[PDB]
């Protein structure tokens, strides 16, 4: 299958530099352009330019001339975005996309969320939301994880290492008084198999190096 | 830059109803090579865009034939013959006839469905958090429609202000519902001082408010 997989740091200070990687797989890298697109959290899409994957030649939109360098690692099927001298306004998700001559942008990377802040990272605490008599209805039980007090966004939450996706709600983060975020992730499961099934929330916060696997089990006494 | 304007800004359509979205360019997208480089993409909740249409009316590989595009010089339309639950999200037209490439303002498609009252759950603080000396109580409203809902926190019957935050999900791509999470945060000492913790929910699907409560220390 055709995929673009991106990676890069999610937190930088003003003045610093960031490298965002776009790895292509499932197709001939050199047959398709890579386009770079900035998406302001909330807002629409701004074209930064593109890189010819055959010749390595980059073309820059006027607003992205100077601090923006598109490059190739052709033998790793990877397109690289370097932003230098980071500014307040560079806080955004940076997307790569595969382009054709007929102007399809068919397949997109998942993006990298870069927050430009002078404030330090804080890793979350992960507390269980235990299934109990107060979280059951019609033979179903709600359970989850509270991911409290982190900065910046984002945090990724999976259940049972990705094996559990049905009935999962991972809520948008709220900004507390402190300038720290908190989010809830919940799942609805059979109340009958709470004795036989294992439910683990996998919480990743890259900026703080936080990697927690929390087993969530019945309330008890 | 070519300005791409889209109307409506948003629409709510029932499953099976037809959809028409308009896109207007500030100049002709007909290039001197005879081709019209207008394209459409869709971005569904929290995800990366997918290509749908190119050259006005050509469907990207694998795109259902419920989708079609039409237009001429500065006016273009995306049409869905029959809307499905998974068509929800933000549709963007975008052009590549003139440098630089530009994206439209976007149209958000919401699915209209039947009224669905929330399932209401509550979670006391974990022993792990209490040990750190803070108490978060979480109220969950699961799978409701429409999106508007009211949560009030009550502690021994006393309406709380200033100690809670809530967020609502994007619309579900399968059952077309929303869910909401509210967290009430107290110091462990303030938590320690009271007995009854209650969240009271008001929603169009409910004929009276639903109270979910517990008594601190009652397994």
């Amino acid at each position: 299958q055709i995929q673009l997989v991106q990676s890069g740091p999610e937190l930088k200070k003003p003045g610093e530099s960031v490298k965002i990687s776009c790895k292509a797989s499932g197709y001939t890298f050199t047959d398709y352009a890579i386009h770079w697109v900035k998406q302001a959290p909330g807002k629409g899409l701004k074209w930064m330019g593109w890189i010819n994957t055959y010749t390595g030649k980059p073309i820059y939109a006027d607003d992205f001339k100077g601090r923006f360098v598109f490059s190739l690692e052709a033998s790793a099927s990877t397109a690289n975005l370097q932003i230098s001298n980071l500014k307040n306004e560079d806080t955004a998700t940076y997307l790569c996309a595969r382009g054709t001559m007929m102007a399809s942008l068919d397949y997109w990377g998942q993006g990298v969320m870069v927050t430009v802040s002078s404030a330090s990272t804080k890793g979350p605490s992960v507390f269980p939301l235990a299934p109990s008599s107060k979280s059951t209805s019609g033979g179903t039980a709600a359970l989850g994880c509270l991911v409290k007090d982190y900065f910046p966004e984002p945090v990724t939450v999976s259940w049972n290492s990705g094996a559990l996706t049905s009935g999962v709600h991972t809520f948008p983060a709220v900004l507390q008084s402190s300038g720290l975020y908190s989010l809830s992730s919940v799942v609805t499961v059979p109340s009958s198999s709470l004795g036989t099934q294992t439910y683990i929330c996998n919480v990743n916060h890259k900026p703080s190096n936080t990697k927690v696997d929390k087993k969530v089990e019945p309330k008890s006494c | 830059d070519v300005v791409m304007t889209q109307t409506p800004v948003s629409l709510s359509l029932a499953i099976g109803q037809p959809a028409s979205i308009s896109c207007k360019s500030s100049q002709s997208l007909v290039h001197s090579d005879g081709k019209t480089y207008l394209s459409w993409i869709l971005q569904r909740p929290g995800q990366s865009p997918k290509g749908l249409i190119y050259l006005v009316s050509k469907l990207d590989s694998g795109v259902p034939d419920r989708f079609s595009g039409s237009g001429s010089e500065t006016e273009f339309t995306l049409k869905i013959s029959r809307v499905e639950a998974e068509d929800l999200g933000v549709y963007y037209c975008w052009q590549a006839t003139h440098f630089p490439l530009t994206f439209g303002s976007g149209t958000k498609l919401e699915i209209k469905r039947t009224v669905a009252a929330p399932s209401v759950f509550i979670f006391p603080p974990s022993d792990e958090q209490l040990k750190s000396g803070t108490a978060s109580v979480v109220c969950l409203l699961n799978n409701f429609y429409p999106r508007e809902a009211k949560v009030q926190w009550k502690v021994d019957n006393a309406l709380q202000s200033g100690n809670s935050q809530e967020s609502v999900t994007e619309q579900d791509s399968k059952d077309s519902t929303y869910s909401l999470s509210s967290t009430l945060t107290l110091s462990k000492a303030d938590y320690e001082k009271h007995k009854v913790y209650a969240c009271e929910v008001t929603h169009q699907g409910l004929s009276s408010p639903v109270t979910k409560s517990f008594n601190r220390g009652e397994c």
Partner: peptide, 9 residues
């Protein structure tokens, strides 16, 4: 690889 609008004029 690129449509005409990808090239500045």
């Amino acid at each position: 690889q690129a449509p005409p609008g990808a090239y500045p004029g």
